[PDB]
Amino acid sequence: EAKGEPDVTVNGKVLRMVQAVDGNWYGYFADRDQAQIADSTATTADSGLDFGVFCASSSGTAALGFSTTETD
């Protein structure tokens, strides 16, 4: 069923959650500065503290398919 996303916030900012097959809504967040610094060290893909590819908050609807503006 298309139930409603839980309205969970950290420091007020909304944190989008994706449902899993275990019926539990999951959401992962981290500090922006620390994550950028860590991904700086990962000079190669899929190794070390590689956070993936950073994208702007306005790009979530285009890439992920849902609004994520309130995130940094």
Next chain:
Amino acid sequence: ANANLFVSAENSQFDNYMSGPQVIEVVVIDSDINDTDEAKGEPDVTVNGKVLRMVQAVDGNWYGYFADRDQAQIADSTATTADSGLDFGVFCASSSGTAALGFSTTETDGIAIPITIANATATGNGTQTGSSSGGAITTTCAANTLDASTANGTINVVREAKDPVAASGSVSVGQIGLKNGTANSGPNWPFIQLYELNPTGNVVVQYNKGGGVQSTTLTFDTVDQFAELSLDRTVFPRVSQVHATITDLWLNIDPTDEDSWTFATNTKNTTSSFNVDTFYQVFDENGASGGSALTLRTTLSSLMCEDNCVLTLDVDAQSSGTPVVTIQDNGDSILTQLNASSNTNANNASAFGISTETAKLGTGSIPVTITEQGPNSGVFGTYDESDKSVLKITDNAKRGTSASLDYNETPQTILVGFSFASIDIQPVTDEWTSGQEIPVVIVDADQNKNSRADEDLDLNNPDVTLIPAL
């Protein structure tokens, strides 16, 4: 106390008051109607007896935004350009909801939708700017006005509205029939429904549900008694960051977003054309611009601002030629030292300004930006997430010389001084024999420059001026 209905203005800290052009978010977080795939019905939510149209979002919560009609019109009267300042978008008649939004909105006093007008007729299209004197609106809007829109999303008072439920099968957009459901960038959502409220008169938001209705009471009155500003300390060292905590309900215009205000606080810039002023949404909550700066000094009188919406700063109370307080760029600001001459330095606060808005926020004028600590806490702070304040004390400040900061017409003095230290060595026993680490205790309030973090001494840190040595 309420189980499902939550109102933004509901705040025991500020005693449920509301004032100014505030847009009030009404959310109905109810588990019985949280699904978005079935053709569910709209919950019966009314304020002062008038029905408040609710839109279901992707999070399963029904949303609805309302504000005072007169205050909203007066605020939008200051929106010289679209999507800037206190812009509420474009107003329309209460009978135009069916033609524009697709659903009836007769019971309201006018709707503010983020459309723009290409054929600006005097009868068939609303007012982009709105009457500066307030009063009822009779301009109607129709479908052709929607089809003739050249830019959607002019509303700047509700910037983080949730996405309306997408239409599918037996469910329409928002379950009530919005024509365009693109949130924060479309012509329909978000939209504010304007209501007639009376200053000093209570506002009652009612949610009607089986088993017992839920009602909340808000007071629509000037809130100067709660506006306050506090300093983290009393005495301050030479380079300590100046932290300002502005507990003001009026400044929380956007309920679903952190609000940013810009002030021209230079109290002694005797230029005739310059005056102390306030600006809205010059910078985003991330310090990424967001729009132009618009005048509000001559409008605050009509915006229920009895000495609680202006900021002015005194940098030298004794006029001794030694300025105390200066400003710098932060993570949520785009400040720039326009006067980059090598003769002066960062201590000359009048050298700082904003490049994009040099007309009023140019050199001098002490452009000061404040950001809300939270989206709806109603408490604003100069210090950013990195703890770099907007205000700092000059390094060459003379002892005893103090500056004063003014908010709510209640001056706050920023004194400059120190404290007597006492370094003590406490051995674990009566003899300090070899191979015995014993604690060294130093009590010095001068080095405690932050009351919300831990300060560690460091030779590599020039800010840490004094380090014990043996």
Next chain:
Amino acid sequence: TANSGPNWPFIQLYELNPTGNVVVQYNKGGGVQSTTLTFDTVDQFAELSLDRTVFPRVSQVHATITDLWLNI
């Protein structure tokens, strides 16, 4: 897909205040559930423990590291 696709998982980036609390809020019908964290250096929680005082001829050396930072 679980961990090989371009969308899930993803981390949302949030500015946090060092030495300041991080509050996670969950707005649900009937009451709000809050969990407040702390974004601060955890060196005071790091310690290494050994399973014996004196180590015999061919004993194993078991080291236990209790470090919050290393749990990325």
Next chain:
Amino acid sequence: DPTDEDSWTFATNTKNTTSSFNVDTFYQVFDENGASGGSALTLRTTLSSLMCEDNCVLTLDVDAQSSGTPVVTIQDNGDSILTQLNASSNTNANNASAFGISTETAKLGTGSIPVTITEQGPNSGVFGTYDESDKSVLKITDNAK
């Protein structure tokens, strides 16, 4: 109404000695929002059969001593639509008989002091002349003695 707050409009002027006029109670002339709730319909000759035991009729007298200066007056608010029928400058707002409902002047015209009450909640059962903005229907006249 168990699912909405009810609104009642009355005809409380006890000295309107016109033979046709009677002290009458009207149901839902103005909705809870203050709009036109429909037409005004007679209820005086029916309250006996509606189990009303002398608790369904409101009567008002703007001056008990008949001194020529009325004590209380009436005024429009958010929960009703009250308009000046006798707009002549010879009379002011202090005349309680100059107020009436324009759309239903047959039984709520000039005179016949229309007092309106709204329920404080959908099912609370408590009614109040004052609206949500603390602006009452009944008001003390300006030049009272």
Next chain:
Amino acid sequence: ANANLFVSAENSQFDNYMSGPQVIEVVVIDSDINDTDEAKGEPDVTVNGKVLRMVQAVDGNWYGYFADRDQAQIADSTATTADSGLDFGVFCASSSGTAALGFSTTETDGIAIPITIANATATGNGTQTGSSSGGAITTTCAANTLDASTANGTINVVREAKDPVAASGSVSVGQIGLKNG
């Protein structure tokens, strides 16, 4: 007190008295029957023993509106015009519920549906204003009575009823078979 049954007249302030043309709402809020996508069973509710048919709303709660027959007839008598005053709508006999609403309502003394009559037959169409002195209801209603109505929603004593559950899959309208929801 009760945990799943909510009646509009449960007020210890007024000693749970009910009088006059009062319409008394009965609400069932149960965790076992509030699934709107499943055809769960109707709650078995009786007022003075008589069964009280309930329609489920989008919030998963079952609603039933009842009032005294004589009082409602007297109050509707004053409603000379439709959808104004103490208008209870159109009175139909108990035996006409199946044709008019889509389900049996025999145990009730009568039902008041929000329609209007366009062919005021003395037998086949129900009364529009109701007897001044009250009394028994005998006039009936049918499907042609619904289709011939020139205006729907003439009840003014219950103005803010919740939206019935829409028909989808195996679930009917209101889970009991309303014709127009």
